[PDB]
Design an enzyme around this catalytic site. Sequence first.
Site, short mmCIF file in Angstrom:
data_model
loop_
_atom_site.label_atom_id
_atom_site.label_comp_id
_atom_site.label_asym_id
_atom_site.label_seq_id
_atom_site.Cartn_x
_atom_site.Cartn_y
_atom_site.Cartn_z
N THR E 1 0.85 -1.21 0.00
CA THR E 1 0.00 0.00 0.00
C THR E 1 0.87 1.24 0.00
OG1 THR E 1 -1.96 0.98 1.00
CG2 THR E 1 -0.17 0.35 2.47
N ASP E 17 -3.56 5.39 -2.09
CA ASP E 17 -4.13 4.68 -3.23
C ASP E 17 -5.31 3.84 -2.76
OD1 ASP E 17 -1.62 2.98 -2.23
OD2 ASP E 17 -3.17 1.63 -2.98
N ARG E 19 -5.70 0.19 -3.84
CA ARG E 19 -5.56 -1.24 -4.07
C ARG E 19 -5.34 -1.97 -2.75
NH1 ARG E 19 -1.13 -3.76 -8.18
NH2 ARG E 19 -2.82 -3.36 -9.68
N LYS E 33 -8.76 3.76 2.35
CA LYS E 33 -7.58 3.68 3.20
C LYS E 33 -7.37 4.89 4.09
CE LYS E 33 -4.96 0.57 0.25
NZ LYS E 33 -3.75 0.43 -0.58
N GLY E 47 0.15 -1.51 7.09
CA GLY E 47 0.40 -2.67 7.91
C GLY E 47 -0.80 -3.59 7.93
N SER E 129 4.09 -0.08 1.23
CA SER E 129 5.12 -0.63 0.35
C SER E 129 5.75 0.46 -0.50
CB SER E 129 4.52 -1.71 -0.54
OG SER E 129 3.42 -1.20 -1.28
N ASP E 166 5.40 0.64 -7.79
CA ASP E 166 5.36 -0.46 -6.79
C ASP E 166 4.14 -1.33 -7.01
OD1 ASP E 166 5.47 -1.88 -4.01
OD2 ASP E 166 3.63 -0.68 -3.90
N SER E 169 0.78 -1.60 -4.33
CA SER E 169 -0.31 -0.61 -4.33
C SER E 169 -0.61 -0.19 -5.76
CB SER E 169 0.13 0.56 -3.56
OG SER E 169 1.39 1.02 -4.01
#
Lengths: 212, 238, 249, 229, 220, 196, 203, 239
Positions: E1, E17, E19, E33, E47, E129, E166, E169
């Site tokens: 994420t 984001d 995802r 989120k 986390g 991430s 990345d 996410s």
Amino acid sequence: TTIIGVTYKDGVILGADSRTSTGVYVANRASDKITQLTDNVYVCRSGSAADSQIVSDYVRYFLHQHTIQLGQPATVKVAANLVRLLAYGNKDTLQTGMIVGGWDKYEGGKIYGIPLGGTIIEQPFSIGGSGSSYLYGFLDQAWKDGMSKDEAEELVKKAVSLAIARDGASGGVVRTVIINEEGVTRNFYPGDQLPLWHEELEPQNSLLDIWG
Amino acid sequence: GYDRHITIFSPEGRLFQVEYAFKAVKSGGVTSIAVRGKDSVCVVTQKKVPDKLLDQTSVSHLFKITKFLGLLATGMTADARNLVQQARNEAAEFRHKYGYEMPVDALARWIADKSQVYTQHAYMRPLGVVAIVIGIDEENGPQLFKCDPAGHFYGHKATSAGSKDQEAINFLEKKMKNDPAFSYEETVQTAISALQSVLQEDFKATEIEVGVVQVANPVFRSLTTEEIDEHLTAISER
Amino acid sequence: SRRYDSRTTIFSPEGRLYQVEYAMEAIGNAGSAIGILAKDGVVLIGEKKVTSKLLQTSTSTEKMYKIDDHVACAVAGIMSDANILINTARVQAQRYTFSYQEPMPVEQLVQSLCDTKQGYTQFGGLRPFGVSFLFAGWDKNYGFQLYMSDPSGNYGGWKATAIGANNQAAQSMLKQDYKDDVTREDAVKLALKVLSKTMDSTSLTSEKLELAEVYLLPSGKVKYQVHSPESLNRLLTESGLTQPAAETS
Amino acid sequence: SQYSFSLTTFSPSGKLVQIEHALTAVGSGQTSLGIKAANGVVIATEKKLPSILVDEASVQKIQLLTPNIGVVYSGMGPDSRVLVRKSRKQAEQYYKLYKEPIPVTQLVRETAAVMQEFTQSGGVRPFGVSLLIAGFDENGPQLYQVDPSGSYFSWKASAMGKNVSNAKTFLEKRYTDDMELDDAVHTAILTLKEGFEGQISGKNIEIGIIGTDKKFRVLTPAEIDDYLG
Amino acid sequence: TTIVGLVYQDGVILGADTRATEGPIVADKNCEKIHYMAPNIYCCGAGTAADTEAVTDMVSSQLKLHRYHTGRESRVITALTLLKSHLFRYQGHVSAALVLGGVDVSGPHLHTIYPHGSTDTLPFATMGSGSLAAMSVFESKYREGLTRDEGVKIVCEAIASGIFNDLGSGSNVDVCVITKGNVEYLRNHVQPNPRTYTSAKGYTFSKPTEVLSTKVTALA
Amino acid sequence: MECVFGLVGNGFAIIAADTSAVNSILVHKTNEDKIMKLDSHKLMGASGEAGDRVQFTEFVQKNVSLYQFRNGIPLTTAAAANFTRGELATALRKNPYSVNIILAGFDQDTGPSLYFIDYIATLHKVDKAAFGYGSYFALAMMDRHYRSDMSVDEAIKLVDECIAEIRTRLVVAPPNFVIKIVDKDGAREFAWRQSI
Amino acid sequence: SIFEYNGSATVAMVGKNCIAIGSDRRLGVQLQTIATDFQRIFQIHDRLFIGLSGLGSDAQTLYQRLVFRHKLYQLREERDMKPETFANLVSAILYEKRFGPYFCQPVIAGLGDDNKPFICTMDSIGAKELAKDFVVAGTASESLYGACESMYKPDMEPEELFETVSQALQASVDRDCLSGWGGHVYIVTPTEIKEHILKGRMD
Amino acid sequence: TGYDLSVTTFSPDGRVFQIEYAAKAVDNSGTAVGIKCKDGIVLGVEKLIQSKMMLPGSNRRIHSVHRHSGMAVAGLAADGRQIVARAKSEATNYESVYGEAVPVKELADRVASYVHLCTLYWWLRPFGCGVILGGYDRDGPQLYMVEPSGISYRYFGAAIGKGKQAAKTEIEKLKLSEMTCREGIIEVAKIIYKVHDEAKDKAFELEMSWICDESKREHQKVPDNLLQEAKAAATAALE
């Protein structure tokens, strides 16, 4: 990390390095590794971030209670002993090494180093954190007892910058905290203000300013 | 039956033990008053030593619950010290748990809630101490509050406690009918004057204690005896 | 501290516990309710004690509560304690249906509640629950059942019984008039008749009454349901017409 | 710490005497009342203070427990704070577990059980308070009353405290279904005026109202005066 | 994420984001989120999910109770200290890590909280991430006194960098603007990568899908 | 290690089990009867650690008997199975029993039933069951020849065939099996299959 | 691991005003096929269904415990619990055992409010995955994700929804060795509940 | 009339009678004097011999509390020992936690809080003893006295027991600011001998403990020689 404490005629000049890392990444570049316990006592936090932070919180709490109960400025010795109360009480869980400095009418400026495991050692100065090792040799030939607020400030800056320049775990800005009869004075020295040691060059905006 | 002895409802719905605690407060001879100003809060009471032996600095009813909160305790001295320890434990715990200074109204509410407990649990005598809390709320400005053995905390612009409740209240609200905005000096001198007009005697600025807060200096502070004496002279010459 | 103890759990020189008897008196001062065990169901009817006109009455019930899909109760006595007891009883029924995965037979629910009450009756020095219950439900074991609980923590099965105010008059009329094979309608009519004849006021008002019946739907499903005010009006009119339809001779 | 001896036993007549003393103790408290309009609810109480020097703005008698719900007390002030705190705690437990506001009826039942606890547990006296909990929720406006015995009811209109009977009869004669919220507010203010010795003012009484689907709000003196004007 | 926090001149901007994955497979293409804690406090959770929602919800409830108790508007330091006191006592077993932001009597606040209770106060923060992908943008483009539109631009750039660079996410960008009084939340501010294919003619289910039994209920 | 299996006929539920009690390599006993009677109309074959098997089976029988006398009406088979599953599942996370249970029974209003209860506390009302290494052979053979309306002769023939295969193909083939049947008359012992 | 001790496949998918929840039908020690008629879908009330993939025992325990709480809510509140509320309840009672977790991966689906579908699955410790197109859980997770991603449509009548969930579940379970042996699909509409059992590969 | 039977019961006069009965128990006990000299503190106690066979030194009434302070108890001695034990506990606990010797002021405050707490409980008998602390802190000599109700104040001189009034009157006639603890020995011995009345009670043994600078700030008994000469002087002072 690096944390240094120096005692001069009037009081203390606790120090830090500002780099909380999680591996090879620098999670924070301006961490504040020196915290307040009372208006005259500060602790240089080092080691585990969570453990040192909460021990700082709990010492500040106990020490608020104490200084109200007595209605009187709490002494450095008591602050250090309170830090040890939790450092020793929780040897199993708290992986923390700290340096406590302050000033009192009773005893003047004193530095108590509470290394990992929870000993109290009153010292003329203390060194801590992983960046300490790069300093033992330098400090041993540098320490002169009874300095002014100035010479002590320069020595703390040199110590932390030398540890910064050579240690992976220590870097950023040097923070210092001068504690005295008139009171705490917090400073901030970026890399640009610190000297340039062996095989280091003067910072420059772009190579386009020199070419190659 | 027992209702005269323990805090259970009397046949007409009164809790006699709480009333007796109030009587205990009014016992002890002492009387105290507080005056909330535009810029300050002044709290004043009378202290008297009967002996040359007793140290005068060890007797006082002003308690620094926190550098920015004070408390004037009227009632039984031992109970006043017990409640004071409890409040000091709460203030530090609040600041620890929530990360900021405990506001005056929170202290008053907590003391009142604690007092209410004695009033409901049969075998716990209500504390015989009326506690006046002064502090300068960081956002609401100067504050004054009064907690009683019953548990009825209410906020007062000006109030009294001890043996001369009514006389002090009458003088204060006579002098305050106009809903004034008292300066600092005016606030503290009004408090001193209302004490004078209740005792019907002067006093050498030694058998009196004053504690004050200021927006320019929020620390709960106890006035120097020379400052009390200067206020006395200013009261004299007008 | 001893002198302030009333010693609730203790035997009087007569060999009987005072607080439980005072509890039965408190029940006696509460609103009346009766139960009729019919062939095809069980009927509970109750008197709403507080009947100020400003009461909302839109709430479905004040004295009868559902304890499970198959069991309901009608409360008399201190409703404050009855709320706690019904909360416990529902909990006990669900605890059985969790452990064994099937409905908890009525008699067991009654017995568990009574064992709750007897605890306060025997040890601890707390006042007993001043409540009394009529239980209506259905089992595979015994089919339709009606039980009555004293605040002593004692209970018994009744073909038809009453609790609360003016208990004994209704009890007597039930003795005189109840018969086996009483069906749904007959049970409802008999309950209304006996209550109103036990009421201080004839031509009762739907706002001052509650009627609930735990019968069995054609497809073997125990269906509890409390009559809406208009259904109460219909039954009240029919009963106030049928009473003279018998008393004419 | 035995403290396990019910101080509220059964008198020989079956009456729970100590609860009756608590009911009297509320009977000597300042008056409060509540009405439910067909499209909202209203609760109000008299807030007359012993002196001008008491800052009336430092405490409110009408307090909202959840944005849907508010309560008024009569009798001992300190006990109402206990009950408000505990009721707020239970409402937040319900919200934690289910992410929805607690229905008015459930909050009332839980507060009633809290009330009842002290009428059986040893070493304590029942609360010298009765509550009018006004709420508006998914199944319409609601006004509930709670008394030291722990029993609760749903009222169309009600009152308690000093001057119960006169306010009660006044409401009974003057109440009617289909009453709007503003009509209910005027009626409540008039009922307070009936027994209110002295003259009403925005700084003497307290009012709280729930609109349609909206939040319980306690009227400020600046606008209660507009209502009563 | 990828979650992000930036303190601009007037207040604190949070970003994240949308995802959510469970290993190498995206469970939820559009996740929420950024979470609400108080009228002036929001937090982006990174986390372990269960832990982040549990801890943020518990602190939200505690903070609301305190708001009632004191009446006055809750401040960020309170949320920070409650999160610390909860996370520490579970010794990092509860693996919730948050970026926390708000505006208070004292002004904008932005902290990062890690599962062991270690906290920081920062002008710009990133986690998840894509924390490195975001911190690239912040260490290149952040400065003091960004205005609301520039600050939101930078946060959107950082999250886009943490989306495209990345794998953990992806999906769409969401943002919450916390000024003094008003919190401007955007449910799906930037949808930068639409569906690349239409599928033309829908595919037919040839096998008639034999069924053995069909109980049917006439729901009321 | 134990083998157990069940079978539901038209009006009966057979349970068979090996009767060998061992330690490591010694058959201390070959008459160890493992199929318990919970009631006049229940069987409970169990497989698992012998101490746990015995202790758990006795505990469950205690609770069944306590229910019977207290209410006057015996636990129905499904309720007994669910109670067993609940107790086993609660013990699972606190002090697990290592017993696998097959419960059969007959209730006048429902007929024969056979429940599958695993040591993980998974409960299922199975038509046919089996536990242990003999489970493979038992299940395959039952599937091959099982019907839903078997006369006790056919069911016992099937159980005999399953026993013969389990002896022939397992390495830990126990020599002695006991066969117990539950019908309208009640839980009972059908026959003992001496081999030695 | 322990999640695939039994093996399951559960799916939920949203139609126009109807919701469909599907599942597998087999109990297994690991690869033993004790019973081809297992139930992973449980009706809690009309318009609300829960699928409990993962360990079978944990599933039965959570189902019985959930019935306890739901019935007591009906007696206390008199309203059947709304879907999202039920999902929050399940999340709370899964997270209570944060460190002792049930090994279930529940799928929750049910109509409610103004006849509006609701679907969500949760981590073993209650992390909800409120989705709107579809939800998948069990050992056939990846295969179900692919099958549903390739077979879904935005708004689907009840019959199209039935056919699509059926084909997705069957094609996704045929690619899994711990699941199959039939299927058990519900189509729940605000006026009707159809419970289908499908013909599957018994291998 | 029924109200004087518990410690959690205010009498309608707003006073607790049980505390007053406790204090009376002290009033019946025996004199205990404390004095705050220029260079320390001197505590003295009139100790009454109940029977002539008691051993001189029996049931000592002046106890240490920690290195730099000590108590003298009057009232029910069995309770005085409990309070002395609590004072020791508090002294050592504070020393442990904060690494500093307890400020006598804080020690007295903790002791007083304990005495008060022992009254709030319906199931405890309030202590029937009054005590005097005299520690010699880094803030200098300072004498406290704690009353069986929980109140305490810092005195320059104190007294409790039978001889309250005579002792206080005599102390006031002394210039504490000018007398060294050596002079305090003589003064306290003389006061105790004056206040005793052989015509009423049996003999007594003066027991005195100095917390001075000769005692290195460490509470100790007065040296035997100085004590005996002070006894002789005090006897001579009666004529």
